[PDB]
């Protein structure tokens, strides 16, 4: 444990622990920054440059940083409402809308910061952001089945070799870490087709319902039975096993 | 939204029309809900003069505004339509956990009308709501059908259905939820089954919103000290159910015996709470978000099922002068697996029995010995009745059809073609009142007299008093009406006043709630029902009680040399009511409760 | 653990104001499907209440990947509902079914005690539900059989 | 089974030395909270020891999913702590109080008759705990009953 | 309650025909062990046989959780073997030991005298063992056996 | 180290402050534990001239090496102070289960200094200690306080608790623990009441560890062995509790009978061991882990209780000429309830008695008759002084300021104005210097010379003989102070020597101990607390009795015309003491018991 550092967010004083980010800062403080790509869960990766905040030094001007990961060391003091960092997050807004129009994430932050879309600059809008947070999700669960696929303007989240995913388990995490809501996750019965590829759902045999896939048990190595039950199912017989004495 | 949900679901059984409708918060604000709302839209839709087995009739299932909350003992419902028994409105109250789970689906109200050409059942899944065939079910009792349908939708589902009493159109038949649970009286449960409908299967995911949650947690915590802390709902229900009452009310001699020819049970101690507790009671069982426990879980016969209840263990016992406990269990459960009435079976099987005392009834006809007395008569008569097998034809009528049937219609002892419960009139003068100017037939709990004079719960009163009697039973008329509507435990009444209720009730529904306006509310919706009753043909001089109870005094007990004096507090009733010396309500009065439409509507 | 949660079937009504009670903690609205909390009434009137008992040894922490269950210093199995991602693998390990998934809310839910202050227990009618001291989890059951004993 | 726990609690006198014993031989220290032999005091001198007779239905056992509860070729209950996953579901099936949960160890806890040599029935001075052969388990109280009329 | 079951220890000689009925009665074959009656012999020639005389309080059934102790119409305490849980609790409620527990069956086993039909009763050379309708002396021997408690 | 948990809760009342301190395990080594120790504690902490009631003086709760074990009767705690009753040192033991609770929430003492501004009770929890009001318990008696106090701490928790009369400061007051075990003489529990302390409440599931476990299962087998082979400890105790002794104390002369007015008692055999066991013994109770199971459970008057131990007995009936013996344990039942000494109570009842012989207390002040044999006075009186109303303002002073008050002091048969308990020392010698040369009063178990002129227990002695008395009086003192310091029954003595004692405490400990080495270390506890008392103001010249005694003869019995000779004792006691002839300690002494840092600080 190191000694805490003493910092000032927008006029606020507060003692925070060594090699903290700037975000962690100012949730403990109060104070709210945007973000796309950060997840809390997922290694951070700095793509989107949305969370960008002033970073000023004893001496040294004001500079734009992320607060998602850049970490508190020093006695700084850190602007959120500043004017070059609203322009620095209109513009990445303007950028990140424009690839998503439809997306209601980015709407609502672009009505937050008046920002439109714009037809001159709007070069093909597939609603995808290139925020990673599906492969970093994939990527901590433990199959690696999708990846980025090309570099620039052309750089594409993809199942390897443009195929149905062979290592895609039916989870159905990536879908669920998507700002823009690019990744459908369709359920149809005891179907589930995600990264067009069909996985079979489970039934319980007393219930009819659906929680997982076969290939999500049989990666977890479940080898209960009862697993294939639904929760609530599962736990009512479970609960039937207690024999209550009435005497 | 808060309290409601806001919608209704609409079922078309002539045409399989499945319809989605917002509910009229207008009408929920004069009305608070379940009996209330309930009538007002039977009111609105219902013709009050049309045939009860008809498909113009409508059944509603009606919830409250804090049916399904964690407000205390909020699990209740109700069903409204026209009483096939008694032709007047009939609004049938039952908790369980079958209210609580369609107001987790997403609704307020259910509304059946026309008749399906075939049995069929719904199934509602939260918005997902569909009809299904139910001619495999149809014919089996409550228990079988709730297991078939339950492994055939969802095991976690609630199922309110009739059972073959209901589908043969008794007419004291009921609906059932959760196999022990009735909504049963002035058949209800017959107009159902004339519809086609086997049960309603309900499976709810969803939730209720709160206003305030903190105050109603406040509220709350206030309620269940004043519950805990009170004798009858902190150790005497959970402890000995509503049978309970069966020491207490025979220790004041107010216990009719023998069709209501004595007040005094000798056989009492064998069939009292205190003695099934000891003897048969397996456990105690609670409705939905009820501190107390009222319930009984019994074994009797080598049956299990839920024990019989105050009026059932009268109906089955004092009514018919059996003191075999066990017997009594056994034809509870006979009447909670077919869906019939223990009061009104139990009534009418006493009936047949004073019948067969002058001989009008022949022994042979019966299948059975009538007795007084005869513990096999009632399981055997409870059978055929829920069947109509041979005497049961007649049995299945209610006792004031049976007795005109042999000429003798003074021997059903009935306010309104419904038969009476355990409370002698001519020794609880309130209890006469309530049974004369019940709207819906003989019941007592839409006024519960019997609390003040016995349990003195409000202030303990004189039961032969006739003085502040009037007053006494139109304040619990309404504030019946108000507490059914809301949809909390009438036996809450004895814990609470109307403070605790609307304390619990504001910070649910999100508006200021007091206890004159739920008095108010409670007062209109006994008023719509007034009208509704004297637009179908219920004259103002069925507000009456059979001769025996008004000319013979009790021969013995510690009642004994009393009658009731319903003349003397009749139009002091009817002047506290603002209704005219005919019984009629009064242009004045119902332009104070807002009523005019209605009355203008029916010309009365 | 400093407190544990004892649950007594045998007590139960099945009224299920514990469900009430803890979807009112926890999602602000009484909505029992999502209580933490299961109670199951069976024929003769045996309702049983079934909730996390925080396993010593839990399937559901050992199967978790992005790190969002562990014990706290209360030994209690704690979700980060920040850190779920939705595989629900911890909804699977569970031997008794006391991990679902809130969809809405996108994360695991389980028991947590109400971070010391069950509102299960609080609003109990019966017992049934009771938190007691993790060094006498057992005192009071034994107690209450022993007293048949006494009596005699 | 061979041999059988009895408790007479007529007989017991409160002085607690059985808990004292089941401690020292399970944990190695004088800890009546974690003996598995719990003798309550209640009023008018009623005292009641109390802890598992291994039930031959078991509750216990019909709700361990880890296969920790088994009972043994002398017809005992026993618990294998190394399969044990701490669930504590088998003090809330037993209808006795007589299984408890060890906190320190992460294990259920519960009578297993010392294998066969009960230090809380060595070291109680009225007898109210017995160690008595199966065939032959409510003999003695019958003979001191019977012996009353002799 | 129409007949009980009278002990008389004074005239009582040690046959132990007594256990031999009962054990070939309800199993099958001589087995005093597994008898309902036990002959306790003392010096002086002192013997007392010992059988369930079905004490109106009874603590074997309240002490009973799983419910298999229930009376009848005779006031006859019987056991449901197809509910015993395996618990020796009836067997330390009765303070008589009269209540034993067949290791076998794994069943509580008393004295159920033989659905009105004792066979201890009718092998009893010296009719220490009888079957006389309740009255004052019957009620008078069974507060004898149970009233005195002690 | 092990035996020992080596920790001192230290409470001050005054500024709430809890704190939680190291044990001095050199003063644990030189003073075993609890007597010793708490002694130790005292005489550092507390100056010897303060007022008992001041704030400066401490109630301490301590506990020896073995307590809370499994060695044999080692369930026994001291409660140490400055008596306000002698003015000396007070040294109070009691058993039951709760110094072992104590030691299992991990501390081996407790010590109380100041004066809490409101009534307050401390509550344990192993390593949770706070102060809670105890206002609504304030006034209730010994049930009742543990009753409510468990109900608001835990089930399972130990309350040593103050009833009314400790409160009321009465001088005989006492601590209270397990509602019928007691730590009362000299008045403890009324400097727990100055204090207003209201009750200890603990609970604790830690363990004592042991450093040596086989070792001390095979001594406990021996000593086991041993215990039961006896025949008073194995036989008599648990046969007839203490109270056996009733027959054999008056068999042999020695039961003072009217205020020590005779040693005979002719109505000795209705209050006996053996007719207690016959008539109104319900069962026996076993202190923890004590083989011997001495305690009574008894019901007298309607009432169950722990029955009337044998100065109880004594005190309410041979002392003041009763043989009601449902009487006495009535008056015990009370002494239990409003914690008082029934030693002490009896014995002002007596002198009161013997006052009003003399036509010197009016009877109608008292509203009871006085006369000897008077069952009603000592039940009515025992209220009265409990609670400090009408004559039982005076009787709350104690015999020898009730003497005082009415000019004759000489009618007390109190040594340091503590009553002399129940052994006549007319017809005993060595009981007769054990009386004045004890360290606290008018007390028999300091040195029990009983046991050898009696019982012949360790060996038989001539009760008229005097040659040998001092040193077997002084041997007797110092294995008593070892005993007590220890944790063990002093009951033990009867069928165990020091070498077991030693053999049982040597593995648990974890160091060599032996019958010399405990016998070294009781003598220095004993000057250490003559020290404590010769520079608390009690001089030399106490070390005497009354005059009844030294100049009457006995009238009548077995030992008639016998009297006390401690005039031909009492040197040779100083001289075998290590004392002068004036009866302080020497530098010589005290240099061989490292007590000389004790004698610089008190500057004697
Ligand atoms: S698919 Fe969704 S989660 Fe993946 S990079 Fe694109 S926007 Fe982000
Ligand atoms: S659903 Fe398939 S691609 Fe998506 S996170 Fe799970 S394993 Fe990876
Ligand atoms: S609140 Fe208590 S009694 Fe009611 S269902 Fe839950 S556990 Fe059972
Ligand atoms: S969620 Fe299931 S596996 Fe995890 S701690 Fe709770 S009960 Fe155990
Ligand atoms: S659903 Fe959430 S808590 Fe459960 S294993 Fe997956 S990431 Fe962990
Ligand atoms: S302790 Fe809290 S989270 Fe757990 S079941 Fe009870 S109310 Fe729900
Ligand atoms: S050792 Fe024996 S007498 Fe002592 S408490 Fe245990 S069972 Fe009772
Ligand atoms: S732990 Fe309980 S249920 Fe299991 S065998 Fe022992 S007493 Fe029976
Ligand atoms: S606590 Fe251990 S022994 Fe008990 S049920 Fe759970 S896994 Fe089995
Ligand atoms: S037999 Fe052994 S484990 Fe069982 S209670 Fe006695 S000492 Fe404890
Ligand atoms: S046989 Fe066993 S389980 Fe059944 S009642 Fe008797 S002791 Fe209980
Ligand atoms: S078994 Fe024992 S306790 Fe039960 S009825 Fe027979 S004698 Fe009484
Ligand atoms: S009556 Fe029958 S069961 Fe009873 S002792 Fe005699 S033979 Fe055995
Ligand atoms: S058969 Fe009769 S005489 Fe023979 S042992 Fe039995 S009771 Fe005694
Ligand atoms: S959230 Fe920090 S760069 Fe995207
Ligand atoms: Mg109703
Ligand atoms: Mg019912
Ligand atoms: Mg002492
Ligand atoms: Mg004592
Ligand atoms: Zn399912």
């Known amino acids: ?247 | 939204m808060f309290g409601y949900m806001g919608k209704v679901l609409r079922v078309n059984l002539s045409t399989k029309n499945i319809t989605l409708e917002p509910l009229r918060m207008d009408w929920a604000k004069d009305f608070l809900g379940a009996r209330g709302l309930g009538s007002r839209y039977l009111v609105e839709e219902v013709d009050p003069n049309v045939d009860p087995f008809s498909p113009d009739n409508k059944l509603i299932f009606a919830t409250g505004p804090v049916t399904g909350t964690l407000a205390t003992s909020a699990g209740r419902f109700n069903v409204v339509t026209k009483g096939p028994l008694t032709g007047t409105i009939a609004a049938s109250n039952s908790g369980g956990y079958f209210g609580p789970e369609l107001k987790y689906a997403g609704y307020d109200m259910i509304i059946f009308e026309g008749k399906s050409a075939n049995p069929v059942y719904l199934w509602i899944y939260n918005d997902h709501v569909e009809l299904r065939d139910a001619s495999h079910v149809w014919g089996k009792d409550s228990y079988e059908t709730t297991d078939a349908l339950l492994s055939e939708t969802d095991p976690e589902a609630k199922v309110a259905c009739i059972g073959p009493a209901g589908e043969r159109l008794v007419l004291f038949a009921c609906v059932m939820n959760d196999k022990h649970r009735a909504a049963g009286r002035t058949g209800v449960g017959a107009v159902m089954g004339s519809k086609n409908l086997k049960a309603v299967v309900v499976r709810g995911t969803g939730g209720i919103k709160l206003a305030d949650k903190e105050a109603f947690l406040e509220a709350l915590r206030k309620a269940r000290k004043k519950i805990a802390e009170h004798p009858v709902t902190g150790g005497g229900l959970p402890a000995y159910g509503t049978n309970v009452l069966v020491n207490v009310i025979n220790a004041a001699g107010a216990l009719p015996t023998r069709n209501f020819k004595e007040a005094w049970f000798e056989g009492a101690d064998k069939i009292s709470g205190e003695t099934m507790a000891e003897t048969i009671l397996l456990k105690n069982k609670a409705c939905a978000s009820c501190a107390s426990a009222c319930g009984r879980v019994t074994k009797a016969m080598g049956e299990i099922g839920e024990g019989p209840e105050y009026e059932a263990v009268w109906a089955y016992g004092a009514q018919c002068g059996v003191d075999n406990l066990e017997a009594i269990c056994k034809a509870n459960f006979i009447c909670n697996k077919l869906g019939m009435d223990p009061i009104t079976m139990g009534s009418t099987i006493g009936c047949a029995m004073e019948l067969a005392e002058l001989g009008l009834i022949d022994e042979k006809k019966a299948g059975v010995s009538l007795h007084w007395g005869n513990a096999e008569a009632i399981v055997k008569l409870t059978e055929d009745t829920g069947y109509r097998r041979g005497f049961g034809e007649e049995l299945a009528l209610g006792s004031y059809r049976l007795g005109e049937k042999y000429g003798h219609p003074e021997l059903s002892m009935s306010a309104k073609k419904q038969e009476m419960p355990a409370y002698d009139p001519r020794a609880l003068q309130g209890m006469g009142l309530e049974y004369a100017t019940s709207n819906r037939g003989g019941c007592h709990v839409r006024g519960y007299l019997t609390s003040p004079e016995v349990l003195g719960i409000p202030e303990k009163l004189d039961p032969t008093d006739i003085a502040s009697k009037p007053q006494w039973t139109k304040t619990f008329q309404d504030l019946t009406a108000a507490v059914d509507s809301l949809g909390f435990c009438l036996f809450l009444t004895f814990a609470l006043d109307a403070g605790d209720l609307a304390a619990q009730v504001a910070p649910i529904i999100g508006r200021e709630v007091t206890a004159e306006e739920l008095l108010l509310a409670g007062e209109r919706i006994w008023n719509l029902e007034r009208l509704f009753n004297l637009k179908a043909g219920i004259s103002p001089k069925e507000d009456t009680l059979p001769p025996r109870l008004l000319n013979e005094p009790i021969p013995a007990g510690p009642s004994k040399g009393r009658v009731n004096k319903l003349h003397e507090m009749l139009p002091k009733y009817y002047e506290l009511r603002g209704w005219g010396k005919n019984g009629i309500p009064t242009k004045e009065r119902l332009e104070s409760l807002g009523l005019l439409d209605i009355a203008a509507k029916y010309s009365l | ?152």
Request: net charge neutral.
């Open chain 3, 1 to 152: 653990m400093e407190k544990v949660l004892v649950i007594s079937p045998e007590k139960c009504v099945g009224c299920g104001s514990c469900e009430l009670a803890c979807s009112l903690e926890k999602e602000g609205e009484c909505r029992p499907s999502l209580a933490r909390v299961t109670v199951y009434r069976f024929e003769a009137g045996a309702n049983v209440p079934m909730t996390c008992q925080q396993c010593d040894d839990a399937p559901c922490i050992s199967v978790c990947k992005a790190g969002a269950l562990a014990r706290d210093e209360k030994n209690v199995v704690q979700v980060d509902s920040s850190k779920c991602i939705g595989c629900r693998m911890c909804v699977m390990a569970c031997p008794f079914g006391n991990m679902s998934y809130h969809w809405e809310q996108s994360t695991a839910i389980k028991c947590d005690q109400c971070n010391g202050s069950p509102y299960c227990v609080e609003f109990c009618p019966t017992k049934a539900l009771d938190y007691v001291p993790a060094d006498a989890i057992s005192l009071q059951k034994k107690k209450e059989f022993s007293a048949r004993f006494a009596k005699i």
């Open chain 1, 1 to 247: 444990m190191r000694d805490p550092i003493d910092i000032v967010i927008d006029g606020v004083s507060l003692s925070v622990p060594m090699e903290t980010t700037v975000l962690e800062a100012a949730q403990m403080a109060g104070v709210e920054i945007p973000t796309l790509c950060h997840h809390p869960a997922l290694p951070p990766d700095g793509n989107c440059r949305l969370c960008m905040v002033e970073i000023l030094r004893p001496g040294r001007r004001g500079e734009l940083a992320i607060s998602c990961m850049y970490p508190i060391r020093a006695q700084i003091e850190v602007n959120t409402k500043s004017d070059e960092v609203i322009r620095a997050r209109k513009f990445v807004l303007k950028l990140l809308l424009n690839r998503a129009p439809k997306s209601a994430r980015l709407n609502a932050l672009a009505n937050e910061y008046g920002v439109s879309v714009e037809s001159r600059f709007s070069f093909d809008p597939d609603e995808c952001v290139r925020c990673d947070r599906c492969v970093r999700a994939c990527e901590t669960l433990g199959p690696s089945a999708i990846g980025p696929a090309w570099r620039g303007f052309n750089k594409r989240i993809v199942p390897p070799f443009m195929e149905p995913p062979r290592q895609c388990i039916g989870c159905g995490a990536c879908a669920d870490v998507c700002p823009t809501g690019y990744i459908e996750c369709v359920d149809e019965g005891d179907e589930r087709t995600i990264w067009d590829r069909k996985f079979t759902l489970i039934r319980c045999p007393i219930c009819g319902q659906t929680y997982t896939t076969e290939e999500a048990l049989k990666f977890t190595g479940i080898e209960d039975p009862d697993a294939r039950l639904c929760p609530t199912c599962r736990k009512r017989e479970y609960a039937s096993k207690f024999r209550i004495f009435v005497h």
